[PDB]
DNA sequence: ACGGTTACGGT
């Protein structure tokens, strides 16, 4: 395998890639992320400045991805996984949502089939050098 | 059934 950028993803594929966490919402059905590594993609949703009330800060347009979180994976990020975390997931499953956009999703794998996993990263690890040459320029 | 639909809500 290897990393992705965010950018470089597509519906229906296995991928790896370094993200910032922006926004978190747990459900008792699930944990949510969205997550960006300040690249573009087409499938992504446009996200409006214009808003009235958002507790979101950016980045705006189509620079984001949801992340839906099940079962251990869930259990596991709840309550560790917070907004502004860096994060590394490896061998998640994208798809498309209802309304056309993409979408990662880490079901649960008792089985251990997949490998996959998603840890913190620690904010200065130099892998995360892009990611934040890249926000500079949409902050 | 292996799920949850909409870019908020801030649980």
Not at 38 to 67: A, D, H, K, Q, V
Not at 95 to 104: A, F, P, T
Not at 115 to 139: G, Q, T
Request: proline share 4%; glycine share 4%.
């Amino acid at each position: 395998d290897s990393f992705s950028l965010l950018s470089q993803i597509t519906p229906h594929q296995r991928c790896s890639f370094y993200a910032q966490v922006i926004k978190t919402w747990y459900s008792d059905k699930n944990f949510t992320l969205y997550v960006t590594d300040y690249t573009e993609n087409e499938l992504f949703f446009p996200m409006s400045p214009y808003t009235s009330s958002s507790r979101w800060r950016g980045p705006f347009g189509r620079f984001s991805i949801r992340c839906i979180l099940w079962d251990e994976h869930d259990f596991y990020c709840r309550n560790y996984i917070k907004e502004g975390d860096y994060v590394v997931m490896k061998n998640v499953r994208t798809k498309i949502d209802h309304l056309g956009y993409l979408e990662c999703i880490l079901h649960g794998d008792s089985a251990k089939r997949y490998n996959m996993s998603i840890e913190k990263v620690d904010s200065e690890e130099p892998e995360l050098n892009e990611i934040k040459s890249r926000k500079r320029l949409y902050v």
